[PDB]
Design an enzyme around this catalytic site. Structure first.
Site, PDB file in Angstrom:
ATOM      1  N   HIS A  34      -2.490   0.891   8.738  1.00 56.97           N
ATOM      2  CA  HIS A  34      -1.226   1.509   8.496  1.00 56.97           C
ATOM      3  C   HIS A  34      -1.287   2.763   7.610  1.00 56.97           C
ATOM      4  CE1 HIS A  34       3.215   1.115   7.904  1.00 56.97           C
ATOM      5  NE2 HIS A  34       2.899   1.830   6.840  1.00 56.97           N
ATOM      6  N   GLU A  35      -2.034   2.698   6.511  1.00 62.09           N
ATOM      7  CA  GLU A  35      -2.075   3.835   5.584  1.00 62.09           C
ATOM      8  C   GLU A  35      -2.859   5.016   6.206  1.00 62.09           C
ATOM      9  OE1 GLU A  35      -0.130   3.679   3.362  1.00 62.09           O
ATOM     10  OE2 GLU A  35       0.183   1.461   3.152  1.00 62.09           O
ATOM     11  N   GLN A  57       3.453  10.069   1.902  1.00 61.90           N
ATOM     12  CA  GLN A  57       4.698   9.451   1.586  1.00 61.90           C
ATOM     13  C   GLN A  57       5.302   9.944   0.307  1.00 61.90           C
ATOM     14  OE1 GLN A  57       3.007   5.301   2.257  1.00 61.90           O
ATOM     15  NE2 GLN A  57       5.082   5.088   3.210  1.00 61.90           N
ATOM     16  N   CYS A 110       7.798  -0.299   6.327  1.00 62.24           N
ATOM     17  CA  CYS A 110       7.254   0.890   5.705  1.00 62.24           C
ATOM     18  C   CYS A 110       8.272   1.391   4.669  1.00 62.24           C
ATOM     19  CB  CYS A 110       7.017   1.915   6.795  1.00 62.24           C
ATOM     20  SG  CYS A 110       6.339   3.513   6.304  1.00 62.24           S
ATOM     21  N   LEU A 111       7.777   1.792   3.487  1.00 64.35           N
ATOM     22  CA  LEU A 111       8.631   2.392   2.433  1.00 64.35           C
ATOM     23  C   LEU A 111       9.375   3.650   2.952  1.00 64.35           C
ATOM     24  CD1 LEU A 111       6.098   2.475  -0.654  1.00 64.35           C
ATOM     25  CD2 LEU A 111       7.814   0.646  -0.145  1.00 64.35           C
ATOM     26  N   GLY A 118       0.812  -1.214   0.000  1.00 62.70           N
ATOM     27  CA  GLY A 118       0.000   0.000   0.000  1.00 62.70           C
ATOM     28  C   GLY A 118       0.854   1.277   0.000  1.00 62.70           C
TER      29      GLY A 118
END
Ligand code: BB2
Ligand code: BB2
Ligand code: ZN
Ligand code: ZN
Lengths: 146, 149
Positions: free
Chosen positions: B134-135, B54, B95-96, B49
């Site tokens: 999370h998002e 981000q 996480c990215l 996602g």
């Protein structure tokens, strides 16, 4: 066609250091659509410029339009020590003010296609440039007064 | 499609509450393009996602795209978790923008708008439910590392 919501003084988005536009975004539909929505928002509000942070986009894009010019990753390379005062108001400050600016600035920036340009502005365009670049560094015009 | 730069932990963009997408933005080329770039960036970073903060866009848009079960990617504009289940799961999250263990609700009921602006309400289970949590945490200025409890 879109007019974006504008952040107001108090909102933390306006106090950040905006991130540079990357190479991949140059000459993209993504970036043309951003620029177009910023330009529409400036027009709807009777602005002569606008910076991306003010429409919740934390990216180094401004528009200067005392033809409107889109500047990507602008950098003010030198300021003249010759100063001038102008009345400024800001779409993000619903309070206007008398602010000292360098009378002339040399600026480098990218166009939407990614071509490097360098140029000088004098007088009002130059104040516009300095105001918008200030937004990219988390500074509102009232912080340049007191 | 455009691959966008991604903010990493310690950039303050990730700590804001992202602003709602306005009515005028719904069904706009602006929004379709934003969503497309977010989508390309998630695929190219091997994420399951992504949230708009981000990619430096402080707006309430996420993408949930588990692969973990495999689901078709869903784009959600102004998502709202209307109910979290009392049941909980714990699993490794990364996480990215940053790994470790996070306790999440095992089910969530979410209301959101499509890119055209149609209202949808959907129940997520298991890993997709964790992805949504999370998002949405990203939209509210919270990184998973703050949830390793
Ligand atoms: C003056 C230096 C540039 C300020 C640019 C702002 C737009 C803005 O907030 N950009 O970040 C503007 O157009 N402000 C206007 C403004 O200040 N104007 C409009 C014409 C004359 C000039 C001076 O008051 C109005 C809308 C408040
Ligand atoms: C509930 C977990 C949701 C995490 C979402 C993140 C991407 C992200 O930062 N989105 O905001 C991700 O894709 N993380 C991956 C991840 O955690 N994966 C990928 C496959 C399954 C799972 C492994 O724990 C990788 C990139 C570390
Ligand atoms: Zn301003
Ligand atoms: Zn994340």
């Amino acid at each position: 066609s879109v007019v974006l919501p504008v952040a107001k003084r108090g909102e933390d988005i306006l106090k950040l250091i905006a991130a540079p536009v990357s190479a991949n975004e140059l000459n993209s539909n993504w970036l043309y659509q951003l620029a177009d929505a910023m330009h529409a928002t400036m027009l709807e509000r009777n602005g002569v410029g606008i910076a991306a942070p003010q429409v919740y986009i934390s990216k180094r894009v401004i528009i200067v339009a005392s033809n409107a010019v889109v500047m990507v990753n602008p950098e003010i390379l030198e300021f003249s020590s010759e100063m001038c005062l102008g009345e400024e108001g800001c779409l993000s400050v619903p309070e206007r003010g008398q602010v000292e600016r360098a009378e002339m600035v040399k600026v480098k920036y990218l166009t939407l296609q990614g071509e490097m340009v360098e140029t000088v502005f004098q007088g009002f365009p130059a104040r516009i440039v300095q105001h918008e670049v200030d937004h990219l560094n988390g500074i509102l015009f009232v912080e340049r007064i007191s």
